[PDB]
């Protein structure tokens, strides 16, 4: 589409050579700054070389500006159950004379338990006292050593993905297109590097917007059913039992098993109970739908409406009413890149065909320009009020661009130049005025709103009172019409008073 907000910060900053024989470049390094634009615009970065007449540009596309958060940590908490077993034996020797552990023996496995398995998981080797005598099965009036082992299992295999965060910094999407032809996408943050690709390090800056009731919130998501929910989650390994934050592990593929080497649990996550050689285990682990402040996919806590935006690396978003933020300018840095220049530009001349659009408003005024040349794309339009750059194709085609005007009757003379050749163009048409749209029920904001033009807010006497019916004749006609209406309303009022007076 169109383009605006040119920079030209590092023009004529090359140290190239003959260029592989005919024409090439080596590297271009500098720094520029891109101001904030409305969602659905393009910011071009036009370079200028001292030898070549014109060069290509670098367009920046922004679609949505959502309110996301960072990633403090990442872990997976699997579902657990209650499993336990025991064994009843007899003393029959000096191994169980008085107590089971003499001083510190915790290895309560006599090469018979089922703990030496890959699906067992984590547990605690405990022990207690039992019965001694003929009524239980032995021949000694002394308690027998009865050991017990409990653990957790996962029959189903439901895997959850929790990501704690307490920053909630503004972010957006960027569809960057390199001048060579490659087009990629990435999600920059507010002041955080965004995986620099081929030297380009375009970053986004915010305004540090405060939150109303966002203190302890997370972005726990489900993998199988793809169910999302907003609920306060725990912190890193050093945690407290009582809320979310049960037995975790290393990764998702390692979350199917609750074995050691990756799974971490502190203490007191499963209870033990026994009356007579039973050693039964009860369940105390709570599910995800058990803590307080457990929301769902649609969340309207406060002024923010947390929706579920389909996007990679993040599935949490939200958009309040029109905010009109202060500034959202970018910052682009370069380290190294290659670009080819033709420098063989020939005679080119264009003209204006159509013109339409709004007043000085959001979408602007779109103007169609037709060109004809042999070069693929060498053009740079420059005029007063606003500057717009775009790309063309080989041959004769039609192109549509948008410019910013501040007058109803757009009748001026701009200068158009493609490559090294220059010419003159003219614009002539009628435009209209559109204000900021109003809110309607049933509709919710998706990403954000940038800004709305509400500066003038005053009627223009030049455009107004034009299609109603030179100035002297108009004043005379208005005066005659006013006198006629005055006589009419006087006659009507006299008739009304006459009707009210009589026939009482």
């Amino acid at each position: 589409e169109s383009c605006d907000e040119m920079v030209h910060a590092d023009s004529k900053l090359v140290s190239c050579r003959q260029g592989s024989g005919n024409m090439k470049e080596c590297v271009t390094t500098g720094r520029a700054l891109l101001p904030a634009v409305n969602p659905g615009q393009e910011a071009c970065l036009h370079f200028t070389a001292p030898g070549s007449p014109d060069s290509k540009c670098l367009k920046i596309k922004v679609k949505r500006i959502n309110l996301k958060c960072k990633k403090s940590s990442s872990y997976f908490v699997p579902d657990a159950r209650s499993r336990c077993t025991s064994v009843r034996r007899c003393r029959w020797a000096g191994d169980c004379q008085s107590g089971c552990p003499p001083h510190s023996t915790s290895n309560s496995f006599s090469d018979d338990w089922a703990g030496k398995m890959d699906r067992a998981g984590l547990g605690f080797s405990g022990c207690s006292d039992g019965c001694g005598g003929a009524a239980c099965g032995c021949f000694n009036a002394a308690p027998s050593c009865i050991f017990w082992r409990k653990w957790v299992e996962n029959p189903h295999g439901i895997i959850w993905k929790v990501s704690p965060c307490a920053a909630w910094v503004p972010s957006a999407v960027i569809e960057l297109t390199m001048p060579s032809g490659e087009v990629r996408t990435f999600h920059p943050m507010s002041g955080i590097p965004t995986q620099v690709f081929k030297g380009v390090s375009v970053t986004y800056l915010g305004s540090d917007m405060e939150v109303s009731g966002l203190t302890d919130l997370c972005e726990i998501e489900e993998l199988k059913s793809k169910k999302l929910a907003l609920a306060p989650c725990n912190q890193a390994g050093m945690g407290v039992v009582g809320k979310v934050g049960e037995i975790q592990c290393s990764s998702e593929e390692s979350a199917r098993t609750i074995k050691k080497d990756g799974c971490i649990w502190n203490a007191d996550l499963v209870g033990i109970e026994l009356r007579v050689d039973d050693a039964v285990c009860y369940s105390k682990i709570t599910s995800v739908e058990a803590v307080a402040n457990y929301s769902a996919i649609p969340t309207t806590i406060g002024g923010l409406r947390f929706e579920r935006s389909h996007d990679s690396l993040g599935k949490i978003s939200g958009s309040p009413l029109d905010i009109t933020a202060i500034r959202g300018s970018f910052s682009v840095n370069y380290r190294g890149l290659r670009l080819s220049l033709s420098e063989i530009t020939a005679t080119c001349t264009g003209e204006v065909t159509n013109v339409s659009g709004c007043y000085s408003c959001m979408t602007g005024a779109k103007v169609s320009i037709k060109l004809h040349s042999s070069k693929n794309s060498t053009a740079h339009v420059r005029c007063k009020g606003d500057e717009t750059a775009f790309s063309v194709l080989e041959g004769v085609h039609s192109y549509t661009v948008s410019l910013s005007f501040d007058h109803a009757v757009v009748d001026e003379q701009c200068q158009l130049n493609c490559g090294g050749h220059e010419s003159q163009v003219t614009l002539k048409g009628n435009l209209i005025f559109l204000d900021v749209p109003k809110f309607v029920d049933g509709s919710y904001m998706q990403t954000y709103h940038s800004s709305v033009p509400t500066g003038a807010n005053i009627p223009s006497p030049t455009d107004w009172l034009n299609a109603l019916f030179r100035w002297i004749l108009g004043v005379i006609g208005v005066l005659l019409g006013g006198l006629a209406l005055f006589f009419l309303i006087m006659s009507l009022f006299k008739l009304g008073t006459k009707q009210v007076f009589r026939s009482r």
């Binding site: 140290s15 190239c16 050579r17 080596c26 590297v27």
Partner: protein, 51 residues
């Protein structure tokens, strides 16, 4: 990096003395090699009959 054993790689407008440089590389059967710093590898057996 500008030149590797008398082979033009980049544009530096000047050459310096040789110096060792540790970097991984791979071949695809072409003329020159391709060096790579960040790469993710995966070992697969596939139970091929050639093995």
């Amino acid at each position: 990096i500008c030149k590797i054993d008398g082979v033009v790689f980049n544009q530096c407008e000047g050459e310096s003395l040789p110096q060792p440089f540790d970097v991984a590389w791979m071949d695809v059967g072409h003329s020159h090699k391709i060096i790579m710093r960040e790469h993710k590898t995966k070992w697969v057996q596939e139970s091929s009959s050639k093995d």
